[PDB]
Symmetry: D3
Subunit: 301 residues, 6 copies
């Protein structure tokens, strides 16, 4: 039976082979991305039974997303290609660290996701229901899907895990705050960035007051991160590793935390695991390339 269920819109990533302006590249690398897609893959590689709910288009790029989700062993009971196109995006990372991203996903098959996008009995028996703030920001339907989804998960006695992921492209801090204001009641585990808390609440403190979920994980760059359970406040191991491709590192972190949770580990081990996946992904090119496999944690253990 499923331990984790994540949902969202998968994307195909087009990245250059090295630093530099995208305008000067003549070759691009292809990867499968998407916040929840990255989390599903990372969990799946760790031995966690995960299911992914979503849609891709009936095109070559959608077929690519599906092969990857299937090769990795994700459950696609409610994942399928459907009329429409698969969204993609282009990334470029500049010499001195100032990167930029371009989207071609507006109106894609996967951006659809409306309430009822799958069968709620799927969630039955599942430990977690992970979502990302990107999804509800895609369209009104998705914003509705999100709420419906976590509500149907609560109704199933399933913990809701949410990764804020404030995408300024999708919506303004106001709408973001709005959704959160409405969604927060049902979140059990909330993943937040210091910059997000600060960009949506003024300071990394106010935010910690407002968004008071049973468990909050505040990621703070290379300065470890703090996990807030039982009013207590555990700090995480900072990392002195330099970023190869920092895209997807936050997704990996979230996945490592969930894996630890799903495996009933103390908050310290959950944090140690979170940035262990986060660091691995940050250390590799691609969105979730670098995510460690079960057998790997075992050996380093």
């Amino acid at each position: 039976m499923l331990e984790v269920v994540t949902a969202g819109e998968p994307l195909v990533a087009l990245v250059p082979q090295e630093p530099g302006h995208l305008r000067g590249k003549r070759l691009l690398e292809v990867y499968v991305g998407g916040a929840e897609v990255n989390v599903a893959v990372a969990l799946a590689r760790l031995g966690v039974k995960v299911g992914f709910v979503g849609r891709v288009g009936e095109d070559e790029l959608g077929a690519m997303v599906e092969e990857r989700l299937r090769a990795e062993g994700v459950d696609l009971t409610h994942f399928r290609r459907a009329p429409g196109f698969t969204g993609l995006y282009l990334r470029e990372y500049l010499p001195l660290g100032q990167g930029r991203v371009f989207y071609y996903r507006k109106g894609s098959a996967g951006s659809a996701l409306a309430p009822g996008a799958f069968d709620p009995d799927y969630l039955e028996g599942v430990r977690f229901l992970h979502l990302s703030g990107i999804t509800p920001a895609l369209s009104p339907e998705a914003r509705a899907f999100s709420l419906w989804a976590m509500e149907e998960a609560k109704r199933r006695g399933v913990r809701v895990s949410l990764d804020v992921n404030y995408r300024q492209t999708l919506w303004s801090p106001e709408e973001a705050r709005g959704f959160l204001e409405r969604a927060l009641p049902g979140v059990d585990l909330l993943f937040l960035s210091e910059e997000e808390a600060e960009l949506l609440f003024g300071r990394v403190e106010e935010a910690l007051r407002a968004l008071s979920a049973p468990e909050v994980v505040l990621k703070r760059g290379a300065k470890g991160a703090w996990a807030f359970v039982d009013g207590r406040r555990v700090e995480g191991s900072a990392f002195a590793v330099e970023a190869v491709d920092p895209v997807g590192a936050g997704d990996a972190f979230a996945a490592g935390y969930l894996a630890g949770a799903v495996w009933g580990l103390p908050v310290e081990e959950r944090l140690r695991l979170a940035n262990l996946l986060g660091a691995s992904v940050a250390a590799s090119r691609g969105d979730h390339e670098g995510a460690p496999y079960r057998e790997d944690l075992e050996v380093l253990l």
Copy 2:
């Protein structure tokens, strides 16, 4: 002074390095494409003074299209980057020959082209205004621009050259037929393929009565091509070369025919030149990569 002026929506092409399904590729080559862009660059390489009218987005792909046109020596007096994104498309050529394309250009800055897009006096003293049937098919504003453009060209004694290029993606054979029947009177040089004639008029014979422009060039696959000028029907040289990447060959063909015209060469030479350009492009990867330079026609001469 300019001899030719083209106009349309530039596109960035993403192409795998060898045959096979796109779902399995991990690398894509980047090329600057677009029917009119391809003609402009080919003419520019042959030494014909050419200007391209159009828009790209204010992103990295748009900047890429601009440096390309600039590097080739295309006049961009009325070409510029504007708010919005640059359209792109993916290509795939299957082992046995069956190909497929995927577009990500809907709502791009380039498909905006509406009447009055450039200063008409730009066309003054110009020999040819070149357009593609792809342009009016992008939208009603582009369909209008098309007509307005040749109207302004005709008003200035500028020969109007039109490459049908029927794209089933954009419109139906009816709307295509509709646009044609309306635009034909302003056309002086019509480039047409057999399939289109049949796909739009039943047979390569009826299409020729209906679409009777002052000079009509009918491409016939490797069976050469026929040039209908002055009740006369010049037959072109058939070529025995295998297509590497046939995509931009028709444009290279028209461009060579135009260069031949702009130079006032006999129909026999325009065809020879047209077939030459088309083959060099067909034998190369990319949309217009492979198009020869004047110095090449000098030597081969």
Copy 3:
């Protein structure tokens, strides 16, 4: 329910990117191969429900073979990674056509296959059990498994399909002849090439009297192929396409013929389908890369 079940030793292929001696290559491409693996993946792409029975080692190459089969949708109920290593082989295609292969598979986890390797009830309700003459040649345990397998299939009314594939590396024409003469009674569909018939029976005529299975398909290079069913001899379509990487073409051929059979198509269509699959693979690099997807036969239809 499964329609076809294949079984054998998977192999990882290492191939240079262009012709030339292997001693001079600095780069090798990695592909998943294996006669039966190739058939399974081709059928899986055509929508035929197929299961592969076999073992790989508990290494990185074995994990690679497994994700591939999983990504393609091959049932692996009885396929798994086991102690030992995964066999691999290097390939080399010389400029003028003379090729050479090098094997590193002796004692691999995959060449273990012995009688009872899987639960026989797996074959229940299955249309075909596919095997290759390469399998029984790997070892006496594999030679036994082979016979046991088809015995179990026949006992279940499952049609037994066998691709001779005489590998001089593994055994002599005598042992090959010996195995054949013993296995033939349990065979319903025999795929054979002219060279093998001659290399094992003197001439492509004697081999046909001796090896008289209910349905025998004799591949004849580019001279098409003959299908001998019901005293009838259907001749196949000859193809005029140049081999890029001929290696996995025979398997693609059998797979298409099997898909045609599983779909209950006339011998003419099985051959058309078999020749189609074989050509698409021959025109591509890799062992089974190039094999078409059902959606391709839909369109070409």
Copy 4:
């Protein structure tokens, strides 16, 4: 006349182009490896007259090993391809530093090497006879070859240089200790790792007591290294350079030490040279790629 003679089994290395699990790679880089092979190449590039004794198979990979040994100028009086195959291996280096290695060398032509594998008069006049602990661990014949070899070198008044190289794949710490226990009497220069001394003697101290050769070089990660001559104990320059591909760095270190010795340099210069080669190789991909040439030491001098 020869200054140094090394012997062992050459291997061909298959490495991915970047970090990551071998299972996800589709391209591999080819290199010539083997402990003693790496030492022979490094010495040869420094101007030291070196001979290499060994065998490769009569295959493309063996031809590759020979071209490399010959291109570099090693003496192959007793090196030749012989019936059988050339051994190979696959390496993979994980994002966070946990690498793994897979072998396909068991039963290779080069694993043969039995006593008398060459003509002992070859050693006559030679300063050193370098061997690696990998060789005697390959087979009983090789274990015999080793002892025979250094015995025939002593009998020739040739110093024996041995690099422990404890390969846990070849044999257990017990057998390792055994061989050393028997071999130690004839070793003049022994190269040891701190981890080895610790893994075979409990602590980097006990080992220093037991293995008391006229000269021992204890490599200690990036913490320089200690050279033990005349009861004295010289320490080596630590290095603050990060590992690109640390494979073969120990071989390079050994080669630089021998080059210094062979050139009659004080123990400090021998150590400075040792980690100068070690650092160069560690700084490059491949097994011995990066080994500096004579002219290089000269310039930095």
Copy 5:
């Protein structure tokens, strides 16, 4: 109207893809280089109106230099291909940092440049005239061109910017001192390296006495740099970034300083800008690849 005019000889750079001796490479990357060429491109990318004076050969490499200068938007009123060849050079960067360069430019079309190489009225209205010490060292004609050029720039009320660039391949410290001794009277902005001052004057102090131009910029490795205006001595921000390809970093630095000057910025902002471009280029492979575009400075601002 032009803000900056630079002149010299463009070169085509052949660099390996990674560290290592050029002798072992089998693939080389192609780039457009040349001290003044690099400066012109960097200025052009920043929005500064720049013109480049020079010559390339009538070969494929010259056509490549011109496309790049044109794509980037440099003014080529006085730049053209002319009978003769385009110079090239090969670079190699060793594992531990000891690189080497090989030239094939002697007698190239661009090495010509004699007094009158262009029309002095071109300089009219221009803020700066940048030159590099490489040019006058190429030939007697060029040495003459330099003096003539800056003299004609002074006569036009144009500030002369000179980057010493002591190339020991072109001339000895004596001839270098000579030219400077004669040229110094007309230099307004002189760019100097600490090693140069030291290699041509004994110590970074004497040099500062002798070469007393209205403004001198002394580059000091990663130790920032000092700008000397009004007897005052401003220091520059040191940088803790490691060199990817340090070739052209000095040109980029010079360009950033000029851009700041051309934009009337205080000496601190000129220095901040100088090493901002310098660092970007040092951070990328190629000669001027990595040079930032206008829009980039804006965003980081």
Copy 6:
């Protein structure tokens, strides 16, 4: 003892990876070339004991040429690196077939060859001395060396083989004719192409009366070739293979003919062998890459 001795200027070839103008390539492949070098390596691969006489510069490209010759087993007794640089050249093959070359070899260490370049006694006991018409064309010193060389060879009863290879770059058909008329008496085996005969004597008929050497082989494109020996005219096998990289094919042809001669094979076999070598090279990239190994002629036999 040596059977053949070649001599000339080695060259390093830089070639793009696919057809197209050189101005647009960003990557170049590196190959060791040189008419005589190509012959030497081909013979060396076929097992013919061969020595190459020549010089390269003391740079990285020269070291590259040397390791190549050494790796192939070419005797370099009189080959060495000397002050100066190694010549290189760029190549470009256009889509439709029109090719162009660019040289950077003037004044190289290799074009120094003057009379007395090696010890004449080196030629003793040697079957053939092979030279190319390219050599005497490099300079008067090389033109002298050429004559001196064959004079010394003839004085030793060594057969002199000469491949005209008329290079319009080096000299005119008159100077070529002049050198020929003077050298011909010392020639025993003359390799000539039809174009050269016509380009130097009007028609492939006159050239044969004038240039009447003991054995003349006239290459005739794909129309095979004629071998004129003993008033007899053996016609060679025409080949129906498409040129991949035709550049070094003529040398591969001569080399095979020479190997055939050195082995004392009938003219029919020399031609068969010559055509075989030429085709294998024509079908491969590089100057002499593709040339077969003896073990290949063994198997194809």
